[PDB]
Design a protein around this ligand. Sequence first.
Ligand SMILES: [Cu+]
Ligand SMILES: [Cu+]
Ligand SMILES: [Zn+2]
Ligand SMILES: [Zn+2]
Lengths: 151, 151
Amino acid sequence: AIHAVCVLKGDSPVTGTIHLKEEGDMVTVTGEITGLTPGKHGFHVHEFGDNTNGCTSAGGHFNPHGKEHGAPEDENRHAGDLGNVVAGEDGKAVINMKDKLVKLTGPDSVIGRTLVVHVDEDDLGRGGHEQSKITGNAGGRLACGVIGITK
Amino acid sequence: AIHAVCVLKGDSPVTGTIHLKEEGDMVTVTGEITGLTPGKHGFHVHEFGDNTNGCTSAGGHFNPHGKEHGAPEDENRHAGDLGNVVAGEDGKAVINMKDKLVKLTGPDSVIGRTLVVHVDEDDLGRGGHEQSKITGNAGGRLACGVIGITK
Ligand SMILES: [Cu+]
Ligand SMILES: [Cu+]
Ligand SMILES: [Zn+2]
Ligand SMILES: [Zn+2]
């Protein structure tokens, strides 16, 4: 089973380590993000593992299948759409999810792409804003990291 | 043609951006590294794209073929062995090389692995030190980055 890791850093006090592994026929995503305002923050795989311009150079959500932005539970979602992380009152969010569209092998592999955590909540495509079906209207990028191969 | 990028940072003032692309049947590696002492510094692909423990968690040189450490020109070399970068008196090194063992596709892809620049010169396996045939005796790690997919 392939194992990957991602260390989050950006123009904010937000930090965290995310681990990804193949488990059965899905990918299991786990970790903790700290330094967040309490509540929901958008969390996605973005297309490029490019940190030449902070988190901005990561580009948009990873979307190899040409879908609209949605919830993890939807069929019409970007491959990179992992919904929201929920920070407690102490500013810390813990992830423990299994996803069928995130891949660590094959044409839709996310190795070498980016994870991003956002300023605002991801509205799952349903907020009625111009960016809802593009980004979930999740606002700016607090921290990001390139997804790398680990032991 | 696949394009990748790597942004170097570590426990030093050493920074830089490295671009990698498929070109013909090799990979072309270009970029600038700054903040270096003048002279030669080892420069390699390491196995893991893991920044959880600075540059140390990148592990050893990428070595899918089970060879000893060598020069880029050698057959008996690690896939990740890119030799030395040469910093001028101004502390800046520029890279422009083509390599046949670095890959951006297939089983020996370096997407999601790490580039590292070192404190010392890489002796190309020929220095007669215990680590020469392991690391080139290149010493500690000034800066590193995960190799990510770019446009
Ligand atoms: Cu995002
Ligand atoms: Cu190295
Ligand atoms: Zn999306
Ligand atoms: Zn080596």
